[PDB]
Design a protein around this nucleic acid. Sequence first.
RNA 1: GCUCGCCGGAAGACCAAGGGUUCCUGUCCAACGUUAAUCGGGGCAGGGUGAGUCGACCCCUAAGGCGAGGCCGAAAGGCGUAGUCGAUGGGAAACAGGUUAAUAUUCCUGUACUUGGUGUUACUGCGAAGGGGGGACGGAGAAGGCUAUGUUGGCCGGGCGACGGUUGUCCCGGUUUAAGCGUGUAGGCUGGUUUUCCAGGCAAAUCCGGAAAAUCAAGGCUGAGGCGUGAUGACGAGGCACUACGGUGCUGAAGCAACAAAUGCCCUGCUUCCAGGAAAAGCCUCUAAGCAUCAGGUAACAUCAAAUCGUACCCCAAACCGACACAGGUGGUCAGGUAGAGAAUACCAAGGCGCUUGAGAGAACUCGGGUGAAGGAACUAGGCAAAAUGGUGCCGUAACUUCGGGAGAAGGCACGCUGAUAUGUAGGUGAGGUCCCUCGCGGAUGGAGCUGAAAUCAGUCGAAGAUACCAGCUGGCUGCAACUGUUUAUUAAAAACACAGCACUGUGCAAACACGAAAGUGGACGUAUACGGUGUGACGCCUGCCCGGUGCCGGAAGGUUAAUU
RNA 2: AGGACCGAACCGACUAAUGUUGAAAAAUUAGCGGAUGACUUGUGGCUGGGGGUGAAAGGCCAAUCAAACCGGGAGAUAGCU
Lengths: 46, 271, 93
Amino acid sequence: MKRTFQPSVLKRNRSHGFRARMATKNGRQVLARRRAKGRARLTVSK
Amino acid sequence: AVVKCKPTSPGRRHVVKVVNPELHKGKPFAPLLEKNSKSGGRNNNGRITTRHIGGGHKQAYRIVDFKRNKDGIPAVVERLEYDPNRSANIALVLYKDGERRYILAPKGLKAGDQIQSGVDAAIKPGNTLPMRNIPVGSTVHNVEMKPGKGGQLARSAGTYVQIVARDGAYVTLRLRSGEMRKVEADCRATLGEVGNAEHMLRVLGKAGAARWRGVRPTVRGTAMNPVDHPHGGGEGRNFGKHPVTPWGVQTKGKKTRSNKRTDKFIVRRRS
Amino acid sequence: MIREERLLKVLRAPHVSEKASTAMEKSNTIVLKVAKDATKAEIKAAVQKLFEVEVEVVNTLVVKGKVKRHGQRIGRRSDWKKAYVTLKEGQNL
RNA sequence: GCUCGCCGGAAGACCAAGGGUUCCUGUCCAACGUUAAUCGGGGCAGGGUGAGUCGACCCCUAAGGCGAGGCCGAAAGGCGUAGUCGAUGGGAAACAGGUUAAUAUUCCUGUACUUGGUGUUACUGCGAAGGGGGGACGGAGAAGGCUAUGUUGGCCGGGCGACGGUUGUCCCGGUUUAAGCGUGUAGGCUGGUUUUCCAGGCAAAUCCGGAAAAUCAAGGCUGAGGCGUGAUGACGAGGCACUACGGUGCUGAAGCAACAAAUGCCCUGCUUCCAGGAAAAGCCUCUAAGCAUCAGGUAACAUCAAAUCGUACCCCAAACCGACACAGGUGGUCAGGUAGAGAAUACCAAGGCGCUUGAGAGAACUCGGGUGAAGGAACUAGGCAAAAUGGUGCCGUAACUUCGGGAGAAGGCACGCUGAUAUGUAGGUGAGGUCCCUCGCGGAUGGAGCUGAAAUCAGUCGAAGAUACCAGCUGGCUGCAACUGUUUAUUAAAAACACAGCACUGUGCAAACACGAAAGUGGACGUAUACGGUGUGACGCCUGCCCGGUGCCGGAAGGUUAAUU
RNA sequence: AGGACCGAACCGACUAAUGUUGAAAAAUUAGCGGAUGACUUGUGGCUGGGGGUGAAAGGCCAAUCAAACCGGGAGAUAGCU
């Protein structure tokens, strides 16, 4: 049966990528929280 | 012509089509076209703001001359064309200086006919004059509401306005609603009725014919749950509410006009 | 013209393999590990000025590094750039 | 290695997405593999992805996103103009053969093509963000011309048969060849060409649009395929020779014709219909400012460039999405033979597989199937399930009906093979020849060869000829819903929803209404034959009485009545 | 010509059996409906939680829905166990 995760790299990067996060104050706050936590990977980009 | 379909399938049994054999069979005049993508009745917030709009056939926009500003220059009707963007047929016309324009096709208009706009124009259908030059008791259409703005009233197939009086800088018009309205005498109108008067006599015959026109199904409030509509709910079929819109406003008799700015231009409501 | 500086940086190694030896003895092609940002023009000029042979054409590809495990710990080797450099029938590197 | 079995519109092949070394070679068998494992998509090491022409990048835009100023909003922000992004669409160019353990339209061989930079000689009005043309567009249908491809014959090579026969109208195999260049065909579209003038195309235009004159009868555009060339080549059945028996090395005949034939191509055509069918650039053309014997442009020539990134491998799957080496899910392309209407179905080809536990035994019981005396729904909530019917042609077919239907109603007959009609018919295809020629890929006659149903008559085998697979059960009365549709993803598919139609009601356009503190936006680039809301639900005959209650609509005297003073 | 007819692909899901620590957190097998349309499908886009979207089942909005998910108020409160 068709499951929920249907991967597409373009859609992934557009919805969750670094530039999408940088485009709004709330996304920038995501990156601030993740940096403060010390995440090795801030976004889906890499 | 208004022709009845033969019942060779149930979806054809009730179809009544309107076949104008005078309409051009080729493509529209390409310089007067524009792209017109569809809304699905959604606004710039991406929200549905008018229900029951979606799908239907792709349509190119035809730039129609509602202003009729080439005054004093005669024009000959090239041909009549189908316009998907409106009920009325349109006419491709050729001006003597080589300009081509689309106009609303008035009743009686044919290829070869002569049309003219402006103060001097003859009193005959297709001609456009300021209403201070049109006799009281004339039938007109494509009537301006502000001088120079372009026609806004009596544009649908078969519609028209009656100039009932002329007083000072104003004329009293009868509209199709039956409303009496004052419009400035400097406003232009085109003589005659809008053509294609048999438009109202077509019968779609099937659900799919409504879908071709971009009309999506209407669900009755009484078929819904209370959360969805004020009419919603009930074990079996129940009503016991006063009929109301989905947003709770009475929908059988309650008047909704509130425009104090324009109240002065109305002489008598439509009744 | 490309500075001698750059040309002394662009070439890293001869690539030694059976396909490389086959290319040498069948098509007069030398196979070279080159800097990742080296272009065909730069590789041509460097080989022509430092091995004093005359170059027909350079073909390039990028080799992607292999994911590996050193003591159950995940690493990855570096991407490197390989150059097939055709020499003109009588140059004999 | 030999046999057997399975798939073959796939269980073969090639991509896109997604994955990321799983690819190839060596070596190892702890763990991983539902067993063992010498094996592996497992461990470890090395190797492997080669582009001016494929794709990305790039030029161009769609929906939509962002958005200088700007408008709006406590702040955050929202909207949006100029712009600038954004493919799933438009835009330059390469093919065949050979080669590696693993890449190839990328390497090699042979033969091509495209865009730009410079520089020659020749001619010369060049130039935009502006104008015009073009690009540039739906659905359905029909038929003609083809090709892919197949069959048969001819040809060439090979063969004479493990058991009766097999020098023959016998058997096996092969009979392939591209882009490009030349030719402009079947066929489709449009009448050209020149002079004069003009309220139009933001300004000008020699361009386009328009009006008029003269003149002429074929001009222009588009266009499959064929033919020629590419090719005195390559490929090629096979044969000989090595062999580290893995695959190479060496050499290589024939390479024609007829017929059939697409869902592919002409075709973005043609015919027809209403629901009326992107954009922008590249491209062509016009001029403005500008330049004015210059730079700039148009042809032929030389010469330089065409970067960068992807390219292995899986890809209906053991490599992607499903926790698994999971009977699930996943868009596009290719399309052989016999039978068949067919991409159904059966058996096969090319190609790929036997699904990572086996060995016995032959109890009950369970699962999936086969057959069954006599009876035939007695079973059961209910014929649930099963059995049955099933094709083509022709005969024949009721009530009722909105005249279409109902209808494949029902019911019934024929059906294999062989021979004759007719040494293979009707039909289709069609060569040589001859004739004409405004001269060719021509037209007319011509009819060789090829191909080929169906029918009838006569015989003939079986229990049975639509013999397998495949493939309607039928009829009568009645409720409900007109109908085709839609729905509770995962216990409900219905009488529920929708529906065409009908009615009421709102709405005069800065519409009513909706989203939004607002600006705005949708409604709609619509205008009462329109648009919103509500109820009813095709169609036919119809739709009675009640305004006391509640709501809505109108009223404007009297009472009561806010802030205010 | 047709929301026309029969029927593959394709889309769906009416009946039965199996399966129910499944081969599968909805499938398999044998039948079944639509199959030029109100059809189906790829790629990308837009609508955001009292909000969307809904041919309307309170359906669906990432195996979650009479108010999603994640974090925070937060050690909510719990005459109850």
